[PDB]
Structures are given as structure tokens and as C-alpha cells.
Design brief:
part of a larger assembly; 10 chains; A alpha+beta; B mainly beta; C mainly alpha; D mainly alpha; E mainly alpha; F mainly alpha; G mainly alpha; H alpha+beta; I mainly alpha; J mainly alpha; C: mainly alpha; Diphtheria Toxin Repressor, domain 2; 68% helix; I: mainly alpha; 1 helix; rod-shaped; binds magnesium ion; RNA-binding; Suppressor protein STM1 (chain F); Small ribosomal subunit protein uS3 (chain A); cytoplasm (chain D); ribosomal protein (chain D)
RNA sequence: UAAUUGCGAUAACGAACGAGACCUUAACCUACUAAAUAGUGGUGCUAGCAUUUGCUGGUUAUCCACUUCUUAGAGGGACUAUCGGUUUCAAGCCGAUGGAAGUUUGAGGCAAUAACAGGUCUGUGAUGCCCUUAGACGUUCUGGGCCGCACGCGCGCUACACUGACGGAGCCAGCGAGUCUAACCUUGGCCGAGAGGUCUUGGUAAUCUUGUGAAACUCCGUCGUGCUGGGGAUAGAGCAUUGUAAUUAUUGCUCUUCAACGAGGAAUUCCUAGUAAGCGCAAGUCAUCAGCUUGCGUUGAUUACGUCCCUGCCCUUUGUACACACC
């Protein structure tokens, strides 16, 4: 790790953008509505908002 | 030289095409009770004092 | 130039209409009235309104 | 009354301290004096000819008395002025780290300043003495 | 390089004689006398001040002011 | 036939001091394609206000 | 003046004048009266000050420009022409020197001589450009007191600046020299000439 | 602890803080007597509050001031503000109100904005010019 | 950044921004509460860091 | 400093180094009209020759002047650093010089010729009366030759 | 009125989008909550000068207390208030007083309907069609070129000096940025005239660089009106830095060389208060290179506070054979 606080918060933002993109390309026919990421101890959590989750 | 002193009675408005000129009615302090309207140059409010280099003349409209 | 919009003038009309008992010639207490009696989204808007409810109030007493 | 250099006008203090080390003779004045420029951002060398090493040392001394510690880089930036780039716009430039570093060692060997911890140079306990001394001497000229 | 640069002992005496009746004396005032270019002019103000004939009511660089002695 | 001297002694061509040259500005609103379009083919793409009820 | 001294001592000339009379660098604000009708209310002189440096807001209302001390107004107009924009400390000093020089010659009050120079160079009447179509004649007009002061200052400073350009004399000297001649107009001054000829032109069209 | 107060003054970004306590009447700016302060053309600016209210009245107190920020003018207007505001803040909690109100009267009458901070402030520049208002040069054609 | 992808038009600069708020709270605690406080009071967007000792 | 007198001793327009020098101008700046000696070089030389800077050209002494010349044409013996000199490390004998007066005109040619004679692009560029140092020649430098 | 902003007139009455509201930034809090990553007083510990108590410093924890200054959370504050002039005594406008603040409080962000064959296929792994596709218009490698110079046009930099250059000395900002699988921001000590080199060090940052001791500016001298010591173009010789590479000279340093330019014809740009102008600085770009831009603070004026003369654009009225709408 060992990052600047400035660079860290920006870096996380870029991470969201690239992640958000990849889902918007991949999950389109599932009605992907966007995401959110929760950084926790022991895990990174990614929640997929989709109208149709049976295909996801 | 017959110097003549006159106090501004009223601000009539702006004359001149460009408009940097103001119409003003004045009263002389020496021998009052007569008023003439003069064309000014600079900025003017009421109760100023204009030095009229020639006592009797006036003008109205400018282009 | 300061010209109060319709929304301010429109509310002030509607307040003095139904609340003339109370209000006042004083803005400061009229302000405090509005917070209790009316729902407004911003401090600034309310002051603009309370100020004009006060203006109208003042001259109503003159007829 | 009691005295600090803070009680003496900036210019005529140093001038009197300048005329002090001059009168003295214990100096360490490297000898490239009169041939050097005091900065790269200058056209001509100091007009004082024989002199002006005193004036800076006297300037340097007082500046370092006025605070905790200063280094060579700090004096380089202090004394460094604006340099004409010719047809190009002016820019701030640092002065010579030789004149200043040698002024620092020449005042130290003479005992007005000492190498401080934290880095830098601290006013010597003996320097407080001598500076507060000729300070009060200057207020004698106005008595 | 038009006159006024050096000493010329007759000029020295010219100074001592002509400085009175000046209400205002300075660098510019000395040059206006058809003599004493500004350098020796600035030196003249100091030596005329060694004793009398001028009173230092002014102070510094770019402006000098002196008055006839009293 | 080289160096400053030679060029300096030569006259300067008039094309140096010339103008913007324009060349087709005021014709900008008149299509050169000669083709245009057709109301039918346009109504297929964008629909026509005549059939609107059946759309709503 | 009943001297008093505390821990960090305040000097004699400092103690003396300051709490006695409120005056200039050292000069008298009293006396110094405007010798012409009008031109008063537009020349400041009481209220008194110490130096001509003041941060006021004179610009945000039409006529409040006139409440500025007229010595300071003289200085403000000194700093201009490019390089000298800003640089009031320069100007403030120049005025101080100028006043001293003016005082040396013909006594009086240098701050009074300033008042004299202002009043004398203000044009009483002037001309403007009135079209009338095609070739345009020139209509005579009587210029206001405010413009009379402004133009007086501007004319005085300019003439001195131009006379102080490319010559051994300094600004303060020429500035003084101008004011001195402009005290009672000798027509040897840049300002007076320009004033008279503005009333010469205004006379021939009337 | 003795009777003491602390005040400030602000012109541009300069803020001058002054500690007014009870004492033998010293007046000091950052290191030094008020008698230098250099610009020195502006010297009489920071003398002003003393001579407005009279050269005494500092005999019972001690004034020390320090300035950070601003510039060789900007700070001078800031320190004189903190000096005068302090003298009037001192009579507030220690002497009697009527002496204080006479001080505010003797100051404000003349003033420079001595008790009151000048609200002026740099305007943000915007693209299209080097200045806030100023635009660039355009040649048309 | 300029608004236009290309170069044409009067030059319109536009400045975005992102604000970073940083707090710190000092606690003198046992091992239990800290570990109890860190696992919960979690949140998206809030970066929680717990350092230790004096050095 | 002081009010001086002298008598007839000082002379205007003294000649040295095959050039003329105005007498009434200060000696440090008086030396500069000589080719090869600028403000710096002049200053140090006067200081090294032990001459008073407050003096004009027309003053000093026929000996002082004679000393001044002696140092100018031998800067390295009299202890001047030789980063101080206009021509150093030659390109033939490797020695350090300071070229003075008429001779600086000569050494510009020598150098200029070496480039041309060697057909170096910098030489060719000189021969065409153009700018060598690499500046854009489109807009600037129109009148010139 | 800045505003289809309102008043008023009124076959209209009452409403919505856009303007306003709103949001962000700069201003006011001795009231609230606090802070060894901010700072004050006191006490120890401690140095100097006077000595009569005093004056001026040192000591990232020797302790105690505080929150004025700094920081940012929650609030509060202004509503053109009060009074008075002017006006259909309407909306408003003007002056005075008070006030942190009374020009939309100052400056921004956002911003409806509609138009243009405005610009961008050279930002896009956005894209239709066309062209090309192995002697390639794919791609990479070496080298050159985009900088080429009789000249025309535009944004600028630096100046023609004495409100100045030069030399000493005084010496004060604000917006920023800065190094992990790395070599970023750099204090300090030595060596060196300089540029720079070398040994170490603090910092992933309100903690270190940095109080960014920036520049104009202030002070004391040197020069004296002479293209002068103003001006620094051009050019010679040498030393260093970035980089695999510096020749057509990346940049920096030193000596030398010392051009035009004596205030600029016809024309034309920008601008109303902490604004104009002067002055430097950080950031973008960046291995090296700012004479550019984006923001920042420092010093700080003159003159309007008006009009429709010029120019530009809006609005009615009017004419129309135009509606792909005078291209
Ligand atoms: Mg500096
Ligand atoms: Mg300096
Ligand atoms: Mg020469
Ligand atoms: Mg607080
Ligand atoms: Mg007020
Ligand atoms: Mg097109
Ligand atoms: Mg595109
Ligand atoms: Mg190109
Ligand atoms: Mg442009
Ligand atoms: Mg020069
Ligand atoms: Mg200087
Ligand atoms: Mg060496
Ligand atoms: Mg020359
Ligand atoms: Mg000009
Ligand atoms: Mg850069
Ligand atoms: Mg660019
Ligand atoms: Mg019709």
C-alpha cells in the first residue's frame, strides 16, 4: 500500500469508473442499473444493481 | 474682466449627442432673483457654483 | 437593482391576507412569525418575504 | 536601561557592526573577495571593494541572532535577488553558497555563531554578548 | 562630456562666492550654474556642509535640500 | 546563387501579401449532393403526424 | 505641552507636535484658505492628516471623490504612466520633498501653495464637439467645480512629469517649480498656459 | 494573571494580533518598539492611535503585537487597527464604559477605519484575461 | 481543462474539483472496544484507519 | 568623499592599447572603450593594479596606467582565475589568453575561418549571413544586412 | 428592473419552464463544539543586556490552563433595515444614519425553447459508407523533417532610462504539489566564483521541503544626461546539467562582443474599485525546455456613474410573389 491520501481517494474514484464501465458493457441485457462498492476489513464488496438478477 | 458667480438651482438633464453635457439652471449670488440656464462640462449636483465668464448668454439643445 | 420577484410578493400578499392579526411593523418578529406559521426552504427567501410583508404592512396603516 | 539589538534601527546597527569587524582585524576574509559577484543574478561585484564581507557577516550575524537557526540555503535565498534574463522576464534567483558558508565559518571561528542541532547555525551565547554590546553603543551616538 | 566634470581651482572659488543668495541649493541647482556635473556636485554639497553656508533641512538620495546660512 | 545576399536582391512575389482566398463559404446552405430525400422514406424513419393516434 | 514618558520612549518632536495640533509631515493645516468662490467643498483642508497615504473608498459613490484630502489627491495623480502604477510610497515621499522645496521658496504654506496652484489652473469655461452635421463647430460650456479641480491636478502633474523627463532635475523639484509658478500664474508653467488657451478657444466660439 | 485582553486587526490577508495587559507602557511590534516599523514613511500611521487619544493612557498597560501575512503596507494598516481596538477593548472590561465610549468617539471621528476592518478583497480572475476584469487583446482580422 | 475536445471556439476553461475531509480522534482503550468499534461503524465512502502507540 | 584640486596634471584623452580614452570619465568605465575589456574585467584589473576607483581616467599616473596595461595582457601571472577570460583552452596550443583591442577583431576571423574552412554547418551558416545559434529565421531579423 | 424583474392599464383571471430561488467561493462572530499535525498566557528548564521589578530569545512534550488569533463542524446575520427626499406618491429610484457586509453584498457554478450544413471522424475498442490491406495507407526499426527564409499578418516578451540602472542593506504574501513495489518534494553539513557536485536527512504530508525570508517595493551609497553605467539583439571562447542521443547550437553558468530602439503614421485593443496598471509565485505541460495558459497574492491610481454620435445586437410597426425561408 503506502499511498498519499490525495492519490488514494482519486485512485478509488477511478476504480469505480472502470468497474462501473465493465458492468455496463457486460450486464446490459440483464438491465444493469449501476453499482456501489463497500470497502470493509477482510473483504471488498461489490453490489450489482440489476432489474433482472436471475441471469446475473 | 467682469467675473460672474452663479449657484446651481436645478439639474435639468443631459444634452449633447454623446451626452457628457448637462443642462442646469443657476442663480447668481451677486444680484439674485434672476435665473439663467447654462451648459456644463464636468459632473454636477445641486448647490454647486459655476463661474460664468460672460454674464448674459445661454443655450438649449446640442448635437 | 432590487425588485422583489412574484414568489416573494405573492406570498406576502397571501400572508397579510389571513394573518393581519399578529404580524407587525417590525421585520424581526415577522421573520420569527414566518418560521412558525409558514414553510420556506431557505433563510434568505424567508427574509426577502418577511421584509416585504413588512413593507406592505407599514403602508397599509397609512391606508 | 538594558538593551537588545531589537532596540536598534536595522541599518545603522549593522553599519556600526560593520565598522566594528573592520576596525578589528580578526576576520577570515577568503581573498577571492573583490573578484566575486555575491550572486549569479548580479551584473557587477559589490562597490565597497575592500569591505562588504564585514557588512554581510554583520548582516548574517544579526539575522541568525534574530531566530533559532538558519542554514546556507536559507541565506542564499534571503540575499538572492531578481536576475535580469535580458530580453526575457525577471525571475527570483539564489545567491552564492560560498560567500555565505564562508561567512558562517568565519563568524564561527571568531565565536559569534555555532553549529546548532536540528541543523543550521545558532547565535552563540558569546555572540549575544557582543551583539547586545555594540547595540547599546549605537544608542550612545543618539544620546 | 560637455564641461562640468573635474575641479578647475577658479571653479572652487566660484562656488564659495556664488553659493549665497541661493534659497534652494542641491545637485540640480549646482549643475544649473553652468558647472559641476552631478558627481562632484554631490560631493560639493557635503564639503559646503563641513562648515556653514548651507542648512540640511532634507535627508536622502535623489533629493537634497539646503538653505543659505543664518 | 546562395546566401542572404542573393535572396535580399530578389523581388518578393505578390502571393506573399495575398488574402484568405475564401473558396466556397456563401454556398454553405445549398447541398451539392443533388439528391435530397423523400417524404415517404422520412415518415418510415420518423413517423408522420397523420398516423400519430395509432402510435400513442 | 506637558511631556510624558513610558517604558519604550516616544521622541520629543514626535511627542510635541502630534498631540498639540494635528498636522502634516510637519506643516500647518490651519490657515490655508481657498481664495476663490466655489472650489470650496471640492478642496479638503480640515480634516487634517499626517501623511498623504490613506486607504479610503472614494470610488464607489459619485461625488465622494471630493472628500479625499487634496494633498493626497495631488499624490495619487503622481503615480501613473506605466512603470509608476501603484508605487504610492514613492509618490508620498516625493510630495513630502516637494512641499519642503516649495516652502523654502517664497515661504507661506506649501500646502497653501498647492491650493493656489489648483484654483488658478482650473478652466472656468471650455468647449466640446457638437456635430451639427458634417463639419462640426465648437460649443462653449461652463465647466463644473469638480472637473475644475480634477483637470487642475492632472494638468499640474503631467506638465511636471514631462518637464522632469530626460533631465537632471528631479520630480519633486519640477513638481514644486510648477506649483510655485501656478500659485499666481506666471504663464511660464505648463498648466496655466493650457488653462488660458482652453478659455481662449472657448471664447472664440460663443 | 493580571488584567489583560487580546485583540486583532485585518487589512487584506494580513492579521495583526495584539496582547494588551497592565504594565509600565511598552509598545512592541513582533520584536521591537513601535518607534521604527520601517516603511517609516507610513510610520505616523501606527503612531496615530496614540496621538488621537493622547500620548498618556498607555502608562498603565503593556502592548505587544505580531503580524503574519500581508505585505509591507498591508500589515501596517493591520497593526494600528489592533493597537487601537485593544485600547478600547481594555477599558471595556476594566475601566468604565464612559471612558471607552469617548475613545470610540475620538477614533471614529477621524479614523482610517481603526476599529473597523476594511472589507475589500482580491477578486478572482477568470479565463480570457490576465486580470479579474481585464480581457485579452483581439485583432478581429 | 478546456471544454472542447478540439481547438475551435473562444477558449472556455472549466475547473472541476474534489474535496477531501480528514478527521482524527484519539482514544485510550482496551483491545475489545477498538476491535468492536472498527468492524462496525463501517460505511461506503468513509475511509477508516486505526494506527497505534506513540511512534 | 573630499574636495580636490590638483593643477594641470590631469590630461583629457589619454591613449593606450592602440585606442583613445576620454579623460573626464571614471577610470573603470574609461577602460571599457577598449575592445575585449568589459565592466567586470576593467574593475578587477584596476583593483589588482592597486589603483583608486574614485579616480577619473585623466588622472592617475603614467606609471599607474603602465601597470594597468601590464596586467591586462598577462592575467594569469597576476592571479586572475581564468574562468574570467574570453579565450581559454585555445584549440591550437591549449593555452589560456585574453584577447585585447585590435586583436579581438583578429581572433573572431580566425575562429570564423576555422569553421568555414572545415565545412562545418556552423561555418556554412556564417557564410550565408544567417543566424547560427539555431533561432527560427522566419519572422525575426528582416532589415539586417 | 440586470431580467416577460415588477407596478400599473386592462376580456381577461389565475399558473408552470427559463430569470429569481438554489449551490460554491470570498467577507462578519471574544456566542457553541474542540485541537502535540494550529496557536496564546503562565510555570518550570534556560541565554544575553541592564540591573529596581525589567527587556529580548532558546527548550515537537517539564507540566498547568485557555480557544482571541488558525483550523471546520452546527448555528446566527441582511431583509436594500431605519429616517428622509423623488415618482401615476405604485413598483421603484436617490441621499443620510447604522451596519462585517446595502453595485443581483463581491466573484462564480447551473441554466428553458430554437437555430448553424460553426468545429471536432487527428481523444475514444463511438460509428455508416468509401478507400487501402503483405513491394500495406497495418506496424515497428534507423535517420531526417514539422525550427527550413527576399517578405506580408497576429498574440506577446524586453526596452528607449534620473518616479532610473547599478551596489550594498531592510525584508512581507497567497493558491498549490510532492516517492511503492519507488527514486517524487528536499532542509542540513562540506567542496565549488558560478552553474553545480557530494555525504546525509524529514515527508505518502496542517507533522517535512516551507514562515515557500517571491517580486515590485523601503533604505544608504555609485553614476549625471552623454545611445550613458539606459538597452541587451547578434556573435566568439570555456565550464556544467537532463537524456540512449544535444550538431540545426534543450537548459543553466562565466568572460567577451554592445546592434535596433530618443515614445512610435494611418489605424486599433482592454477596462469602473482592492478594479486598471505595475509585480512576482504555484499548478498544467515536464526526462530536459515558458517569453504560453490556469489560478494566486503583493503594491495600488486617474476618470464616468452618462448618453445613442459611431459600432454591435434586441424590440415593436410595416411590406413580401420568400417557408429548402435573401446563401
Ligand atoms: Mg528577498
Ligand atoms: Mg538584495
Ligand atoms: Mg568593451
Ligand atoms: Mg474562534
Ligand atoms: Mg457608513
Ligand atoms: Mg461546413
Ligand atoms: Mg469525435
Ligand atoms: Mg508548428
Ligand atoms: Mg488570442
Ligand atoms: Mg544593463
Ligand atoms: Mg535595488
Ligand atoms: Mg573551480
Ligand atoms: Mg552604451
Ligand atoms: Mg506612450
Ligand atoms: Mg513549470
Ligand atoms: Mg501553449
Ligand atoms: Mg404579414
Amino acid at each position: 500500500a503506502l499511498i498519499s491520501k490525495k492519490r488514494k481517494l482519486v485512485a478509488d474514484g477511478v476504480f469505480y469508473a472502470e468497474l462501473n464501465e465493465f458492468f455496463t458493457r457486460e450486464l446490459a441485457e440483464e438491465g444493469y442499473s449501476g453499482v456501489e462498492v463497500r470497502v470493509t476489513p477482510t473483504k471488498t464488496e461489490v453490489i450489482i444493481r440489476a432489474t433482472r438478477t436471475q441471469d446475473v | 474682466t467682469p467675473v460672474t458667480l452663479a449657484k446651481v438651482i436645478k439639474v435639468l438633464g443631459r444634452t449633447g449627442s454623446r451626452g457628457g453635457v448637462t443642462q442646469v439652471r443657476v442663480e447668481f449670488l451677486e444680484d439674485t432673483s434672476r435665473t439663467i440656464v447654462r451648459n456644463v462640462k464636468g459632473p454636477v449636483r445641486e448647490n454647486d457654483i459655476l463661474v460664468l465668464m460672460e454674464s448674459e448668454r445661454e443655450a438649449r439643445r446640442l448635437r | 437593482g432590487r425588485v422583489r420577484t412574484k414568489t416573494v410578493k405573492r406570498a406576502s400578499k397571501a400572508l397579510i391576507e389571513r394573518y393581519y392579526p399578529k404580524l407587525t411593523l417590525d421585520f424581526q418578529t415577522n421573520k420569527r412569525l414566518c418560521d412558525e406559521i409558514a414553510t420556506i426552504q431557505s433563510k434568505r427567501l424567508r427574509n426577502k418575504i418577511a421584509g416585504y410583508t413588512t413593507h406592505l404592512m407599514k403602508r397599509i396603516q397609512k391606508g | 536601561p538594558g538593551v537588545s539589538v531589537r532596540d536598534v534601527a536595522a541599518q545603522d546597527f549593522i553599519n556600526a557592526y560593520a565598522s566594528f569587524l573592520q576596525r578589528q582585524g580578526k576576520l577570515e576574509v577568503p581573498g577571492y573577495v573583490d573578484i566575486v559577484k555575491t550572486s549569479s543574478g548580479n551584473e557587477m561585484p559589490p562597490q565597497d571593494a575592500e569591505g562588504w564581507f564585514y557588512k554581510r557577516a554583520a548582516s548574517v550575524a544579526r539575522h541568525i541572532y534574530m531566530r533559532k537557526q538558519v542554514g546556507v540555503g536559507k541565506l542564499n535565498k534571503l540575499y538572492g535577488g531578481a536576475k535580469s534574463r535580458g530580453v526575457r522576464p525577471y525571475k527570483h534567483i539564489d545567491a552564492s553558497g560560498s560567500i555565505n558558508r564562508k561567512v558562517l565559518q568565519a563568524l564561527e571561528k571568531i565565536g559569534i555563531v555555532e553549529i546548532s542541532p536540528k541543523g543550521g547555525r545558532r547565535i552563540s551565547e558569546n555572540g549575544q554578548r557582543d551583539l547586545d554590546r555594540i547595540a547599546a553603543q549605537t544608542l550612545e551616538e543618539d544620546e | 562630456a560637455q564641461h562640468a566634470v573635474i575641479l578647475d581651482q577658479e571653479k572652487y572659488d566660484r562656488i564659495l562666492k556664488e553659493v549665497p543668495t541661493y534659497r534652494y541649493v542641491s545637485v540640480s541647482v549646482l549643475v544649473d550654474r553652468l558647472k559641476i556635473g552631478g558627481s562632484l556636485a554631490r560631493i560639493a554639497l557635503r564639503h559646503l556642509e563641513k562648515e556653514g553656508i548651507i542648512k540640511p533641512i532634507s535627508k536622502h538620495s535623489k533629493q537634497a535640500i539646503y538653505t543659505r546660512a543664518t | 546563387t546562395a546566401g542572404r545576399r542573393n535572396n535580399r536582391s530578389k523581388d518578393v512575389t505578390d502571393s506573399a501579401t495575398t488574402k484568405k482566398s475564401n473558396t466556397r463559404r456563401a454556398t454553405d446552405r445549398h447541398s451539392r449532393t443533388g439528391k435530397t430525400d423523400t417524404k415517404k422514406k422520412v415518415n418510415q424513419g420518423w413517423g408522420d403526424d397523420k398516423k400519430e393516434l395509432s402510435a400513442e | 505641552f506637558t511631556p510624558v514618558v513610558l517604558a519604550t520612549p516616544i521622541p520629543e518632536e514626535v511627542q510635541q507636535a502630534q498631540t498639540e495640533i494635528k498636522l502634516f509631515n510637519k506643516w500647518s493645516f490651519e490657515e490655508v484658505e481657498v481664495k476663490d468662490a466655489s472650489l470650496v467643498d471640492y478642496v479638503q483642508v480640515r480634516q487634517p492628516i499626517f501623511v498623504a497615504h490613506t486607504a479610503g473608498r472614494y470610488a464607489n459613490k459619485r461625488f465622494r471623490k471630493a472628500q479625499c484630502p487634496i494633498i493626497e489627491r495631488l499624490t495619487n495623480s503622481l503615480m501613473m504612466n506605466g512603470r509608476n502604477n501603484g508605487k504610492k510610497l514613492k509618490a508620498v515621499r516625493i510630495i513630502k520633498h516637494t512641499l519642503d522645496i516649495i516652502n523654502v521658496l517664497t515661504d507661506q504654506n506649501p500646502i497653501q501653495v498647492v491650493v493656489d496652484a489648483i484654483t488658478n489652473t482650473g478652466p472656468r469655461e471650455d468647449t466640446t464637439r457638437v456635430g451639427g452635421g458634417g463639419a462640426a463647430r465648437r460649443q462653449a460650456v461652463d465647466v463644473s467645480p469638480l472637473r475644475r479641480v480634477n483637470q487642475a491636478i492632472a494638468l499640474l502633474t503631467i506638465g511636471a512629469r514631462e518637464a522632469a523627463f530626460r533631465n537632471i532635475k528631479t520630480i519633486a523639484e519640477t513638481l514644486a517649480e510648477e506649483l510655485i509658478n501656478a500659485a499666481k500664474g506666471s504663464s511660464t508653467s505648463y498648466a496655466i498656459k493650457k488653462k488660458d488657451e482652453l478659455e481662449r478657444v472657448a471664447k472664440s466660439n460663443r | 494573571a493580571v488584567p489583560s485582553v487580546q485583540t486583532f486587526g485585518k487589512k487584506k490577508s494580513a492579521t495583526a494580533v495584539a496582547h494588551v495587559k497592565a504594565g509600565k507602557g511598552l509598545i512592541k511590534v513582533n520584536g521591537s518598539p513601535i518607534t521604527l516599523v520601517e516603511p517609516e514613511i507610513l510610520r505616523f500611521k501606527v503612531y496615530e492611535p496614540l496621538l488621537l487619544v493622547g500620548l498618556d493612557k498607555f502608562s498603565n498597560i503593556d502592548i505587544r503585537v505580531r503580524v503574519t501575512g500581508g505585505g509591507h503596507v498591508s500589515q501596517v494598516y493591520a497593526i494600528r487597527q489592533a493597537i487601537a481596538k485593544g485600547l478600547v477593548a481594555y477599558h471595556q472590561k476594566y475601566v468604565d464604559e464612559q471612558s471607552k465610549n469617548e475613545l470610540k468617539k475620538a477614533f471614529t471621528s477621524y479614523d482610517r477605519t481603526l476599529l473597523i476592518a476594511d472589507s475589500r478583497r482580491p477578486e478572482p480572475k477568470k479565463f480570457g484575461g490576465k486580470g479579474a476584469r481585464s480581457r485579452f487583446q483581439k485583432s478581429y482580422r | 481543462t478546456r471544454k472542447t475536445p478540439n481547438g475551435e471556439g473562444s477558449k472556455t476553461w472549466e475547473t472541476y474539483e474534489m474535496r477531501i475531509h480528514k478527521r482524527y480522534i484519539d482514544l485510550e482503550a482496551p483491545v475489545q472496544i477498538v476491535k468492536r468499534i472498527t468492524q462496525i461503524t463501517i460505511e461506503p465512502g468513509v475511509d477508516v484507519e486505526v494506527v497505534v502507540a506513540s511512534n | 568623499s573630499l574636495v580636490v584640486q590638483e593643477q594641470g596634471s590631469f590630461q583629457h584623452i589619454l591613449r593606450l592599447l592602440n585606442t583613445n580614452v576620454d579623460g573626464n570619465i571614471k577610470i573603470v568605465y574609461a577602460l571599457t572603450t577598449i575592445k575585449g575589456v568589459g565592466r567586470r574585467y576593467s574593475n578587477l584589473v584596476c583593483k589588482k593594479a592597486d589603483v583608486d576607483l574614485h579616480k577619473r581616467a585623466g588622472e592617475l599616473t603614467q606609471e599607474e596606467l603602465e601597470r594597468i596595461v601590464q596586467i591586462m595582457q598577462n592575467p594569469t601571472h597576476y592571479k586572475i582565475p581564468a574562468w574570467f577570460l574570453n579565450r581559454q583552452n585555445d584549440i591550437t596550443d591549449g593555452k589560456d589568453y585574453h584577447t585585447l583591442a585590435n586583436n579581438v577583431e583578429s581572433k573572431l576571423r580566425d575562429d570564423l575561418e576555422r569553421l568555414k574552412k572545415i565545412r562545418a554547418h556552423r561555418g556554412i551558416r556564417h557564410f550565408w549571413g544567417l543566424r547560427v545559434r539555431g533561432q527560427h529565421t522566419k519572422t525575426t531579423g528582416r532589415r539586417r544586412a
